Amino acid sequence: RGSHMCDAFVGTWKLVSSENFDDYMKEVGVGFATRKVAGMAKPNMIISVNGDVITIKSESTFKNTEISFILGQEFDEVTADDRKVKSTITLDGGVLVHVQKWDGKSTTIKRKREDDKLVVECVMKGVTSTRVYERA
Numbered sequence: 001r002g003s004h005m006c007d008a009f010v011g012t013w014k015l016v017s018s019e020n021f022d023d024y025m026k027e028v029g030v031g032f033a034t035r036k037v038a039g040m041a042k043p044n045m046i047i048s049v050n051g052d053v054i055t056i057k058s059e060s061t062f063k064n065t066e067i068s069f070i071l072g073q074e075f076d077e078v079t080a081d082d083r084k085v086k087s088t089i090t091l092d093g094g095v096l097v098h099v100q101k102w103d104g105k106s107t108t109i110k111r112k113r114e115d116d117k118l119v120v121e122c123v124m125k126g127v128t129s130t131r132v133y134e135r136a
């Protein structure tokens with residue numbers, strides 16, 4: 001197998017900034033104690049590509065998580081804040097677009113490369129958060 005555009009995401013990343021994540025989590029419905037502990041976390045994100053399968057791992061003092069998926073193919077995800085969601089991730093012009101659906105709600109997480117950073121932008125009912133990762 002040859003190179004893929006999404007190889008731009010592959011590597012080991014560390015959170016360096018987080019904006020408005022508490023308000024995003026409130027909109028998602030995250031309870032007080034989980035919001036406080038999850039908001040403190042400075043996760044590492046490890047992204048790998050093997051054939052058609054993309055794996056995104058997150059490691060932090062709060063939770064360790066791993067999802068593996070094929071673009072366009074829905075999967076079951078248990079999120080770090082313990083939602084059981086249906087997730088679909090697609091590639092739109094270089095941007096990984098991740099929709100989570102649960103309990104009649106939905107949120108969108110976009111992951112994109114900007115300069116040497118990995119930028120994560122998420123939105124829930126008009127509330128956006130931006131989290132920036134750098135190479136570890």
Ligand SMILES: COc1ccc(S(=O)(=O)Nc2ccc(F)c(C(=O)O)c2)c2ccccc12
Pocket residue numbers: 025028030038039041043045058060062079080081109120121122130131
């Ligand atoms: C460390 O507490 C979390 C880790 C992960 C998730 S999530 O369900 O994976 N969605 C998401 C949204 C924006 C982001 F920037 C990232 C990220 O930084 O990876 C992840 C969380 C969702 C709700 C509350 C806390 C979350």
